Design a protein around this ligand. Structure first.
Ligand SMILES: CC(C)(COP(=O)(O)OP(=O)(O)OC[C@H]1O[C@@H](n2cnc3c(N)ncnc32)[C@H](O)[C@@H]1OP(=O)(O)O)[C@@H](O)C(=O)NCCC(=O)NCCS
Ligand SMILES: CCCCCC(=O)O[C@H](CC(=O)O)C[N+](C)(C)C
Length: 599
């Protein structure tokens, strides 16, 4: 970002070896057997002995930190995304459900879309001018690098690994966005010759031309190709761009500031599954027969505007994290609520260029294969959207407890109630207080949380006694959270030690081939909090076949929840997990209310 600000930021540290290993052993106690823990304990001692393997790997990481801006940056981006070969849809690209808008006709839909585009361009002005306000977390300045990765960027299919292109700072920065309607892409300039951005009224006029130039959905949904396996898409992509026209259209899409998807009307569904269907529409598009072909999942930022008033977005994870994305959302949404002023008669405008695609028998086959693949993915995705209206951050705070920790502890309780045991739990932690920092792992399953979930369901433990255990678990989780954001967690560290071993060309350390580590890294619960002023909520698929994907936005009086699971695993059920979570939160409130502290 603004290089001045970035330079004053501390560099991602490398936690002490013995410290991280100690935290690791503690986080394992609640998720592994005594026999397994005892063995790991032995591997740890040997691993960190003087003159041992761990010490050499640690030294390597410290050297890496001295010759790079962030010793973790490239490794993370690579292992977490660029090398992740599964489809980006559902398994990687997070989806976001925004507050439903009130437009009831085409003009209204296009009206909001125009306002949204203008709001994004407004936010972009701060990025180009580097005037974007500095943010804080834990009272520390935060990295703003992510904001210069979301716009005018795109992921690119690679035979072995993927790459990312960013034109935000190219010789002549893109001044156009891409609009998709009925699977057809259009190149739309949102800036005038002089350099000033088009007005909402002006953008609206352009969207109309675009909409009328693609009234029928007869064209092939070429964009659905971006939802297939990366290896398959890499090859299909290479073929697709062999045509001059096709390559030209793709280039326009990749360079576009961002994409706006004008989704078509979808079959009315039951009211008890409506929100789940809107979440699916934002995450994957619903299917090849709906709006899945009306997208380009390699594009970093995709804003979706439904015909029935619904709206949201889906973004490619290799670019940024949640906070930056939601920050842009809060600004855009708040912008669409701003009144109108200058309604002067706008001057004529050019016809948005239509990014055509020359289909061939081979390309057609690729599209069909993509449809088939996407159909399987969607059929296996189990989503449950839960709006916890009972309460929000308000109650936990009135109890002098961290809301997020309260929620995480509630999730642990809910899981234990269902399966009778704890499980490796992952909660995203922001490392933005460090230059180029992304995230680390907060492990919600601990000695204190397990002690709580056990005593909580113990009909032989005094209700007041469960209160102490509850507060202790919450405090323990808050402590872990504070350490994580300060670069004191151990997950990314341990990952670094393993990649370092690989780089040092030494045999894989036993500690990394240990069963305990496999268990610890197999997150049956993958979660993250998406704080936002806008009453929205994010969602993503589970990270493992037998796990859940839980995302939430804690508001003051309520909490927006999203729970995902796979139908391939009979042991998991999104609705059930959501219900136990809701009940878990309530029971914890009841417990605390039944035993006030003040007198
Ligand atoms: C882990 C994380 C979410 C915790 O955030 P947090 O703001 O500390 O969450 P908390 O629940 O502790 O605090 C929320 C509110 O409760 C309050 N609070 C916390 N502890 C409290 C206490 N003991 N008593 C009273 N109030 C308390 C906070 O002041 C805050 O108040 P606000 O509503 O006025 O802002 C954050 O540190 C982080 O890392 N976020 C990034 C996650 C991410 O990257 N997500 C996207 C992944 S792609
Ligand atoms: C709208 C975005 C909601 C959060 C998505 C998220 O948490 O992505 C995580 C990023 C990280 O922790 O590195 C990964 N995860 C989805 C697997 C938790």
């Amino acid at each position: 970002s603004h290089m001045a600000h970035q330079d004053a930021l501390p560099r991602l540290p490398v936690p002490p070896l013995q410290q991280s290993l100690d935290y690791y052993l503690k986080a394992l106690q609640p998720i592994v057997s005594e026999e397994e823990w005892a063995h790991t304990k032995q591997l740890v001692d040997e691993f960190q002995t003087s003159g041992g393997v761990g010490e050499r790997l640690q030294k390597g990481l410290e050297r890496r930190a001295k010759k790079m801006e962030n010793w973790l940056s490239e490794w993370w981006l690579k292992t977490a995304y660029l090398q992740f070969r599964q489809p980006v849809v559902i398994y990687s690209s997070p989806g976001v459900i925004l507050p439903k808008q009130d437009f009831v006709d085409l003009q209204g839909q296009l009206r909001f879309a125009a306002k949204l585009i203008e709001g994004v361009l407004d936010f972009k002005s701060m990025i180009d001018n580097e005037t974007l306000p500095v943010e804080f977390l834990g009272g520390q300045p935060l990295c703003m690098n992510q904001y210069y990765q979301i716009l005018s960027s795109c992921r690119v299919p690679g035979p072995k690994q993927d790459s990312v292109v960013n034109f935000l700072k190219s010789k002549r920065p893109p001044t156009h966005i891409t609009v998709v309607h009925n699977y057809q892409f259009f190149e739309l300039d949102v800036y005038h010759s002089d350099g000033t951005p088009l007005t909402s009224d002006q953008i609206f006029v352009q969207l109309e031309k675009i909409w009328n130039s693609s009234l029928q959905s007869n064209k092939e949904p070429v964009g659905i190709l971006t939802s297939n396996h990366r290896n398959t898409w890499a090859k299909a992509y290479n073929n697709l761009i062999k045509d001059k026209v096709n390559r030209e259209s793709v280039n326009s899409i990749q360079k576009s500031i961002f994409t706006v998807c004008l989704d078509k009307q979808v079959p009315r569904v039951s009211d008890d599954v409506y929100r789940n269907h809107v979440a699916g529409q934002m995450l994957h598009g619903g299917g090849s027969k709906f709006n899945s072909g009306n997208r380009w999942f390699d594009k970093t930022l995709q804003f979706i505007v439904a015909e029935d008033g619904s709206c949201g977005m889906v973004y490619e994870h290799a670019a940024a994290e949640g906070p930056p994305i939601v920050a842009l959302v809060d600004h855009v949404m708040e912008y669409t609520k701003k009144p109108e002023l200058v309604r002067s008669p706008m001057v004529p405008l050019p016809m948005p260029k239509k990014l055509r695609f020359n289909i061939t028998p081979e390309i057609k086959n690729d599209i069909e294969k993509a449809k088939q693949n996407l159909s399987i993915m969607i059929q296996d995705l189990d989503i449950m959207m839960l709006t916890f209206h009972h309460f929000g951050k308000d109650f936990p705070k009135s109890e002098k407890l961290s809301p997020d920790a309260f929620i995480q502890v509630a999730l642990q309780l809910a899981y234990y109630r269902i399966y009778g045991q704890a499980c490796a739990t992952y909660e995203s932690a922001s490392l933005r207080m460090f230059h180029l920092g992304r995230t680390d792992t907060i492990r919600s399953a601990s000695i204190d949380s397990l002690a709580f979930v056990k005593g909580m369901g113990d009909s032989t433990v005094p209700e007041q006694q469960k209160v102490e255990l509850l507060r202790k678990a919450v405090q323990a989780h808050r402590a872990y959270t504070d350490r994580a954001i300060r670069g004191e967690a151990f997950d990314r560290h341990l990952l670094g030690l393993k990649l370092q071993a690989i780089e040092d060309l030494v045999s894989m350390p036993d500690i990394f081939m240990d069963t305990s580590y496999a268990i610890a890294m197999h997150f049956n619960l993958s979660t993250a909090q998406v704080p936002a002023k806008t009453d929205c909520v994010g969602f993503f698929g589970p990270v493992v076949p037998d796990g859940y994907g839980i995302c939430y936005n804690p508001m003051e009086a309520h909490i927006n929840f999203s729970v995902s699971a796979y139908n391939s695993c009979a042991e998991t059920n999104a609705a059930r997990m959501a219900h136990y979570l809701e009940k878990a939160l309530l029971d914890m409130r009841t417990l605390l209310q039944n035993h006030p502290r003040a007198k």
